[PDB]
Amino acid sequence: MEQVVIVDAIRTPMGRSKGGAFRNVRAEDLSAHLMRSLLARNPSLTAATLDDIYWGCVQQTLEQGFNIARNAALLAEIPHSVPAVTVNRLCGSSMQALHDAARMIMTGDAQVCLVGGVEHMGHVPMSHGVDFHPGLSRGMMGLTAEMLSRLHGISREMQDQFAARSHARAWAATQSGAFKTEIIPTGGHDADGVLKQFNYDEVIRPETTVEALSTLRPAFDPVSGTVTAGTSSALSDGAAAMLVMSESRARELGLKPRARIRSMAVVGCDPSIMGYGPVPASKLALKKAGLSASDIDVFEMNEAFAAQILPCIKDLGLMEQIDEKINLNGGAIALGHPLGCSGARISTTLINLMERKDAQFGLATMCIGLGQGIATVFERV
Amino acid sequence: MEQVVIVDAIRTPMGRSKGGAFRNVRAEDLSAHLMRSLLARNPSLTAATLDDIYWGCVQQTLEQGFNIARNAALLAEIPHSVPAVTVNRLCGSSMQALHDAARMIMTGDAQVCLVGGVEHMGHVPMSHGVDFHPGLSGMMGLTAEMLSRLHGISREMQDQFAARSHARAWAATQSGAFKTEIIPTGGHDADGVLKQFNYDEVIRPETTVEALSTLRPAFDPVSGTVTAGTSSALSDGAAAMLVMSESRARELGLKPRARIRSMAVVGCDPSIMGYGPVPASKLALKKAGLSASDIDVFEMNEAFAAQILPCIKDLGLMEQIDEKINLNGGAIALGHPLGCSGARISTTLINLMERKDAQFGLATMCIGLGQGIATVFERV
Ligand SMILES: [Ca+2]
Ligand SMILES: [Ca+2]
Ligand SMILES: [Cl-]
Ligand SMILES: [Cl-]
Ligand code: NA
């Protein structure tokens, strides 16, 4: 079986969904922009040699409906002979896209694929078109969302410190140019309604402090709740993308792999213990890779809530490694959690950090709504 | 890499979307019904050993939103530990579910998966929540009818093929040919009384070429040839398959009913609607090391008679239509519930392969906005 290498990995800026950069830019255009860009940045790839396009997106209606992967590819002027499919495993959708594309390559059904995802939460909000089956109805929000923080004694103060850290790290990455290698300037509109090329994550708040976060009211129970809006993922609009191929094809084309997929895992877990997914998903991915958590040099763990990611970090035995290894350029608290895009976004952030840290192994993992988890171990070379 | 075998393949009846069987049954319930059924029918499979569930569905909002694969699996009381994902390649979605699950097994990331799909077109119609990018392109007569104009497929030829679809589907209904694949499914009869349906309510046995000849063109009034009567029906339904490595099947003492020989997906020109099955099938056959003549049974999704006839012609199969193609009818009679159709035609194909003692079958379909998907199955 062929091994699967990532040859390029890019993303849009994360726009503020509530009135920000991409309020007048459609999901298919954010997507098409990255698809076009992946091709443009890699001249040795002839576009018609793409074998498939896998794209994550959750709220598949309105501008995200009717197979956005294909709509975006047509808008990007990728040859119509290249097929395209849209994948939905909620939060993990574009990491799923990576997995299915990689397996298409491993089996020889493909040699090159585009992978990525998008979520335009400003245009197709999570609350839009909801009709949950009565049979899944399952105070209950706090009960479930804070189960892990109650279990692991993760206080409001620890959550606020982690959230302040997310913005501080994302801002330091912005200021130092550390995100320049992954962000493709993308057109949006500034506060005055004027066309603007964005080359930074609008959604990061450099004014964030632990003091200010400490003023906020609990999102759930007013008396015992610890989660706040300030320690939950931001609401952003964005896309992320990767060019993946067999190691053979990369060699033929004379492209240096940026990373290789070492293992992939996806798991179910109890939906009522929200956010636990990364633990069994990461353990399974590590087992499949022949590695332990200690072998991993850089982790990207999606920050849906500080109240959930901290327990996961604690359970994987990583609490003392947070500042050396985990979400080193911040995470979804600062950058947002545009569902469809997040899997490829954290994989893109991870690979760039691996390069800068000269890391041998990286792990990207995330929780998934209604009790799932997904993880990928990446290896450099 | 492991060979991937299909141990079971089942579907609901196709309910009439306009006020028929499943008007009060949710998409997640049609899906969960089939998941439960696969488990009941294969008792040596322990549900906690499922490695994933891939489910096709296109209109993923309302009751089909928020990853219906998972929601249906939880409703079916499949253990929480089993993951689930919903896939969307329009018309080809549940065939895509098959391919991705197959490859998960081939690479050893899985040993057993559920595959299937659903589309409840009554509850989430194709016209709901549409916002098509202004910069982009089955409507518009020019594109829908291009193949029929290139190949000289007349109104009369289209009406003939459509009447044949209902006739073959009704014959299958009467002969018991669908008994093995249809799981009786709760719906409501015309008076609102609970009823277990075990037949495809949407088929119209009274269809005649004479009646079809009366209909108006769907597109241009003057020169249009396609009609609603020669386009796929609107039905609600689900289909599902239990797929596993040949090794795991042996361990569980479950008999393989077919195995995957090859898989293909291709893009094609979106302005030449319905052509996908041609390059998809040619690619699948090439990868299989087979020719079209090796295939004993073909399932070619009937989006429009005007498009499937040219596809048949370009694959060199015009003389084999009654011998090999859509032998129990197709989407003109049975409907085209997008998410479900890939697994549905695969299910119908595998059961026909058994009834005909075939070695090779090919199932293929066009996909909106210019794609094609195909699978070659083998029965050893
Ligand atoms: Ca480069
Ligand atoms: Ca080391
Ligand atoms: Cl069956
Ligand atoms: Cl077989
Ligand atoms: Na490796």
PDB file of N, CA and C in Angstrom, chain A residues 190-247:
ATOM      1  N   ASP A 190     -13.896  45.199   5.322  1.00  0.00           N
ATOM      2  CA  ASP A 190     -13.500  45.781   6.592  1.00  0.00           C
ATOM      3  C   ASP A 190     -14.722  46.366   7.296  1.00  0.00           C
ATOM      4  N   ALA A 191     -14.502  46.986   8.446  1.00  0.00           N
ATOM      5  CA  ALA A 191     -15.637  47.462   9.256  1.00  0.00           C
ATOM      6  C   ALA A 191     -16.496  48.525   8.546  1.00  0.00           C
ATOM      7  N   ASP A 192     -15.923  49.179   7.543  1.00  0.00           N
ATOM      8  CA  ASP A 192     -16.562  50.277   6.842  1.00  0.00           C
ATOM      9  C   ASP A 192     -17.254  49.789   5.583  1.00  0.00           C
ATOM     10  N   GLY A 193     -17.171  48.482   5.327  1.00  0.00           N
ATOM     11  CA  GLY A 193     -17.790  47.903   4.151  1.00  0.00           C
ATOM     12  C   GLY A 193     -16.928  47.949   2.911  1.00  0.00           C
ATOM     13  N   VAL A 194     -15.665  48.306   3.086  1.00  0.00           N
ATOM     14  CA  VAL A 194     -14.730  48.412   1.974  1.00  0.00           C
ATOM     15  C   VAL A 194     -13.993  47.079   1.770  1.00  0.00           C
ATOM     16  N   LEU A 195     -13.820  46.685   0.505  1.00  0.00           N
ATOM     17  CA  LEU A 195     -13.067  45.463   0.156  1.00  0.00           C
ATOM     18  C   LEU A 195     -11.713  45.473   0.827  1.00  0.00           C
ATOM     19  N   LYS A 196     -11.355  44.348   1.438  1.00  0.00           N
ATOM     20  CA  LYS A 196     -10.098  44.276   2.157  1.00  0.00           C
ATOM     21  C   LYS A 196      -9.502  42.874   2.014  1.00  0.00           C
ATOM     22  N   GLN A 197      -8.192  42.794   1.758  1.00  0.00           N
ATOM     23  CA  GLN A 197      -7.540  41.481   1.757  1.00  0.00           C
ATOM     24  C   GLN A 197      -7.134  41.229   3.205  1.00  0.00           C
ATOM     25  N   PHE A 198      -7.672  40.177   3.805  1.00  0.00           N
ATOM     26  CA  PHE A 198      -7.312  39.770   5.159  1.00  0.00           C
ATOM     27  C   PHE A 198      -6.179  38.766   5.159  1.00  0.00           C
ATOM     28  N   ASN A 199      -5.129  39.031   5.951  1.00  0.00           N
ATOM     29  CA  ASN A 199      -3.982  38.103   6.081  1.00  0.00           C
ATOM     30  C   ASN A 199      -3.726  37.696   7.530  1.00  0.00           C
ATOM     31  N   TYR A 200      -4.752  37.866   8.364  1.00  0.00           N
ATOM     32  CA  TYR A 200      -4.676  37.537   9.775  1.00  0.00           C
ATOM     33  C   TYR A 200      -6.051  37.151  10.294  1.00  0.00           C
ATOM     34  N   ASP A 201      -6.052  36.424  11.398  1.00  0.00           N
ATOM     35  CA  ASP A 201      -7.306  35.973  12.021  1.00  0.00           C
ATOM     36  C   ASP A 201      -8.015  37.085  12.798  1.00  0.00           C
ATOM     37  N   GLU A 202      -9.039  37.642  12.173  1.00  0.00           N
ATOM     38  CA  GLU A 202      -9.780  38.797  12.708  1.00  0.00           C
ATOM     39  C   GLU A 202     -10.383  38.485  14.056  1.00  0.00           C
ATOM     40  N   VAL A 203     -10.673  37.210  14.245  1.00  0.00           N
ATOM     41  CA  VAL A 203     -11.399  36.763  15.412  1.00  0.00           C
ATOM     42  C   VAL A 203     -10.557  36.714  16.710  1.00  0.00           C
ATOM     43  N   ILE A 204      -9.226  36.711  16.605  1.00  0.00           N
ATOM     44  CA  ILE A 204      -8.376  36.724  17.819  1.00  0.00           C
ATOM     45  C   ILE A 204      -8.560  38.061  18.547  1.00  0.00           C
ATOM     46  N   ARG A 205      -8.588  38.022  19.880  1.00  0.00           N
ATOM     47  CA  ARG A 205      -8.768  39.246  20.673  1.00  0.00           C
ATOM     48  C   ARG A 205      -7.544  39.530  21.518  1.00  0.00           C
ATOM     49  N   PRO A 206      -6.655  40.404  21.028  1.00  0.00           N
ATOM     50  CA  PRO A 206      -5.429  40.644  21.779  1.00  0.00           C
ATOM     51  C   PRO A 206      -5.688  41.351  23.095  1.00  0.00           C
ATOM     52  N   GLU A 207      -6.867  41.956  23.246  1.00  0.00           N
ATOM     53  CA  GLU A 207      -7.218  42.589  24.511  1.00  0.00           C
ATOM     54  C   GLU A 207      -7.650  41.589  25.592  1.00  0.00           C
ATOM     55  N   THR A 208      -7.765  40.310  25.254  1.00  0.00           N
ATOM     56  CA  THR A 208      -8.185  39.316  26.234  1.00  0.00           C
ATOM     57  C   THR A 208      -7.253  39.221  27.454  1.00  0.00           C
ATOM     58  N   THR A 209      -7.822  39.231  28.660  1.00  0.00           N
ATOM     59  CA  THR A 209      -7.033  38.994  29.869  1.00  0.00           C
ATOM     60  C   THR A 209      -7.818  38.030  30.744  1.00  0.00           C
ATOM     61  N   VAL A 210      -7.113  37.346  31.631  1.00  0.00           N
ATOM     62  CA  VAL A 210      -7.792  36.498  32.618  1.00  0.00           C
ATOM     63  C   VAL A 210      -8.731  37.325  33.468  1.00  0.00           C
ATOM     64  N   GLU A 211      -8.303  38.544  33.832  1.00  0.00           N
ATOM     65  CA  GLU A 211      -9.176  39.439  34.611  1.00  0.00           C
ATOM     66  C   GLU A 211     -10.530  39.697  33.930  1.00  0.00           C
ATOM     67  N   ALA A 212     -10.495  40.029  32.642  1.00  0.00           N
ATOM     68  CA  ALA A 212     -11.713  40.295  31.902  1.00  0.00           C
ATOM     69  C   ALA A 212     -12.534  39.007  31.766  1.00  0.00           C
ATOM     70  N   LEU A 213     -11.866  37.884  31.485  1.00  0.00           N
ATOM     71  CA  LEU A 213     -12.623  36.625  31.385  1.00  0.00           C
ATOM     72  C   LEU A 213     -13.311  36.282  32.704  1.00  0.00           C
ATOM     73  N   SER A 214     -12.686  36.666  33.821  1.00  0.00           N
ATOM     74  CA  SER A 214     -13.247  36.354  35.133  1.00  0.00           C
ATOM     75  C   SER A 214     -14.527  37.103  35.457  1.00  0.00           C
ATOM     76  N   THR A 215     -14.885  38.102  34.648  1.00  0.00           N
ATOM     77  CA  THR A 215     -16.106  38.866  34.904  1.00  0.00           C
ATOM     78  C   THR A 215     -17.348  38.196  34.320  1.00  0.00           C
ATOM     79  N   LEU A 216     -17.125  37.264  33.407  1.00  0.00           N
ATOM     80  CA  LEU A 216     -18.215  36.756  32.612  1.00  0.00           C
ATOM     81  C   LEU A 216     -19.100  35.822  33.436  1.00  0.00           C
ATOM     82  N   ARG A 217     -20.367  35.731  33.046  1.00  0.00           N
ATOM     83  CA  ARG A 217     -21.314  34.869  33.755  1.00  0.00           C
ATOM     84  C   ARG A 217     -21.213  33.462  33.171  1.00  0.00           C
ATOM     85  N   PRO A 218     -21.496  32.437  33.992  1.00  0.00           N
ATOM     86  CA  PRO A 218     -21.523  31.053  33.485  1.00  0.00           C
ATOM     87  C   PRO A 218     -22.496  30.941  32.320  1.00  0.00           C
ATOM     88  N   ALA A 219     -22.180  30.083  31.367  1.00  0.00           N
ATOM     89  CA  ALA A 219     -23.076  29.816  30.260  1.00  0.00           C
ATOM     90  C   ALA A 219     -24.244  28.940  30.698  1.00  0.00           C
ATOM     91  N   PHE A 220     -24.025  28.102  31.703  1.00  0.00           N
ATOM     92  CA  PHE A 220     -25.047  27.116  32.082  1.00  0.00           C
ATOM     93  C   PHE A 220     -25.616  27.420  33.465  1.00  0.00           C
ATOM     94  N   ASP A 221     -25.397  26.571  34.457  1.00  0.00           N
ATOM     95  CA  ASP A 221     -26.023  26.880  35.760  1.00  0.00           C
ATOM     96  C   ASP A 221     -25.426  28.162  36.374  1.00  0.00           C
ATOM     97  N   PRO A 222     -26.271  29.128  36.773  1.00  0.00           N
ATOM     98  CA  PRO A 222     -25.710  30.392  37.256  1.00  0.00           C
ATOM     99  C   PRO A 222     -24.886  30.253  38.530  1.00  0.00           C
ATOM    100  N   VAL A 223     -25.154  29.218  39.308  1.00  0.00           N
ATOM    101  CA  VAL A 223     -24.480  29.090  40.591  1.00  0.00           C
ATOM    102  C   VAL A 223     -23.299  28.115  40.566  1.00  0.00           C
ATOM    103  N   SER A 224     -23.413  27.013  39.849  1.00  0.00           N
ATOM    104  CA  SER A 224     -22.322  26.040  39.866  1.00  0.00           C
ATOM    105  C   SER A 224     -21.603  25.940  38.521  1.00  0.00           C
ATOM    106  N   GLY A 225     -22.126  26.641  37.512  1.00  0.00           N
ATOM    107  CA  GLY A 225     -21.539  26.560  36.137  1.00  0.00           C
ATOM    108  C   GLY A 225     -20.153  27.178  36.105  1.00  0.00           C
ATOM    109  N   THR A 226     -19.270  26.626  35.264  1.00  0.00           N
ATOM    110  CA  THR A 226     -17.909  27.161  35.095  1.00  0.00           C
ATOM    111  C   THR A 226     -17.600  27.612  33.653  1.00  0.00           C
ATOM    112  N   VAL A 227     -18.147  26.908  32.665  1.00  0.00           N
ATOM    113  CA  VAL A 227     -18.007  27.343  31.270  1.00  0.00           C
ATOM    114  C   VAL A 227     -18.583  28.743  31.085  1.00  0.00           C
ATOM    115  N   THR A 228     -17.893  29.569  30.306  1.00  0.00           N
ATOM    116  CA  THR A 228     -18.493  30.829  29.874  1.00  0.00           C
ATOM    117  C   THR A 228     -18.354  30.933  28.361  1.00  0.00           C
ATOM    118  N   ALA A 229     -18.982  31.949  27.776  1.00  0.00           N
ATOM    119  CA  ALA A 229     -18.786  32.181  26.345  1.00  0.00           C
ATOM    120  C   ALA A 229     -17.314  32.447  26.050  1.00  0.00           C
ATOM    121  N   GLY A 230     -16.612  33.018  27.015  1.00  0.00           N
ATOM    122  CA  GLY A 230     -15.205  33.401  26.796  1.00  0.00           C
ATOM    123  C   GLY A 230     -14.260  32.209  26.865  1.00  0.00           C
ATOM    124  N   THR A 231     -14.757  31.061  27.339  1.00  0.00           N
ATOM    125  CA  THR A 231     -13.904  29.875  27.424  1.00  0.00           C
ATOM    126  C   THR A 231     -14.455  28.765  26.542  1.00  0.00           C
ATOM    127  N   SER A 232     -15.363  29.153  25.648  1.00  0.00           N
ATOM    128  CA  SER A 232     -15.899  28.259  24.616  1.00  0.00           C
ATOM    129  C   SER A 232     -15.304  28.692  23.289  1.00  0.00           C
ATOM    130  N   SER A 233     -15.326  27.817  22.294  1.00  0.00           N
ATOM    131  CA  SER A 233     -14.829  28.218  20.964  1.00  0.00           C
ATOM    132  C   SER A 233     -15.518  29.472  20.430  1.00  0.00           C
ATOM    133  N   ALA A 234     -14.754  30.300  19.736  1.00  0.00           N
ATOM    134  CA  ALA A 234     -15.327  31.468  19.077  1.00  0.00           C
ATOM    135  C   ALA A 234     -16.192  31.058  17.894  1.00  0.00           C
ATOM    136  N   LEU A 235     -16.974  32.014  17.420  1.00  0.00           N
ATOM    137  CA  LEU A 235     -17.777  31.803  16.227  1.00  0.00           C
ATOM    138  C   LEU A 235     -17.045  32.448  15.047  1.00  0.00           C
ATOM    139  N   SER A 236     -16.389  31.624  14.228  1.00  0.00           N
ATOM    140  CA  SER A 236     -15.708  32.133  13.051  1.00  0.00           C
ATOM    141  C   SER A 236     -16.160  31.462  11.748  1.00  0.00           C
ATOM    142  N   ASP A 237     -15.864  32.145  10.636  1.00  0.00           N
ATOM    143  CA  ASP A 237     -16.093  31.633   9.281  1.00  0.00           C
ATOM    144  C   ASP A 237     -14.734  31.317   8.667  1.00  0.00           C
ATOM    145  N   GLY A 238     -14.583  30.145   8.046  1.00  0.00           N
ATOM    146  CA  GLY A 238     -13.257  29.832   7.476  1.00  0.00           C
ATOM    147  C   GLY A 238     -13.262  28.561   6.670  1.00  0.00           C
ATOM    148  N   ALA A 239     -12.171  28.342   5.939  1.00  0.00           N
ATOM    149  CA  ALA A 239     -11.919  27.090   5.217  1.00  0.00           C
ATOM    150  C   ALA A 239     -10.464  26.712   5.445  1.00  0.00           C
ATOM    151  N   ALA A 240     -10.146  25.424   5.267  1.00  0.00           N
ATOM    152  CA  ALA A 240      -8.777  24.950   5.307  1.00  0.00           C
ATOM    153  C   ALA A 240      -8.619  23.864   4.248  1.00  0.00           C
ATOM    154  N   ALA A 241      -7.391  23.638   3.786  1.00  0.00           N
ATOM    155  CA  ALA A 241      -7.230  22.665   2.685  1.00  0.00           C
ATOM    156  C   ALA A 241      -5.844  22.065   2.678  1.00  0.00           C
ATOM    157  N   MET A 242      -5.713  20.886   2.139  1.00  0.00           N
ATOM    158  CA  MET A 242      -4.449  20.186   1.976  1.00  0.00           C
ATOM    159  C   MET A 242      -4.398  19.461   0.630  1.00  0.00           C
ATOM    160  N   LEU A 243      -3.183  19.373   0.154  1.00  0.00           N
ATOM    161  CA  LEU A 243      -2.917  18.602  -1.056  1.00  0.00           C
ATOM    162  C   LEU A 243      -2.220  17.319  -0.566  1.00  0.00           C
ATOM    163  N   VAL A 244      -2.805  16.155  -0.857  1.00  0.00           N
ATOM    164  CA  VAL A 244      -2.279  14.885  -0.345  1.00  0.00           C
ATOM    165  C   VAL A 244      -2.024  13.959  -1.527  1.00  0.00           C
ATOM    166  N   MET A 245      -0.955  13.185  -1.463  1.00  0.00           N
ATOM    167  CA  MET A 245      -0.693  12.256  -2.562  1.00  0.00           C
ATOM    168  C   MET A 245       0.088  11.063  -2.064  1.00  0.00           C
ATOM    169  N   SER A 246       0.194  10.047  -2.898  1.00  0.00           N
ATOM    170  CA  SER A 246       1.106   8.950  -2.560  1.00  0.00           C
ATOM    171  C   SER A 246       2.543   9.455  -2.456  1.00  0.00           C
ATOM    172  N   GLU A 247       3.341   8.800  -1.636  1.00  0.00           N
ATOM    173  CA  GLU A 247       4.749   9.155  -1.576  1.00  0.00           C
ATOM    174  C   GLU A 247       5.416   9.015  -2.955  1.00  0.00           C
TER     175      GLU A 247
END
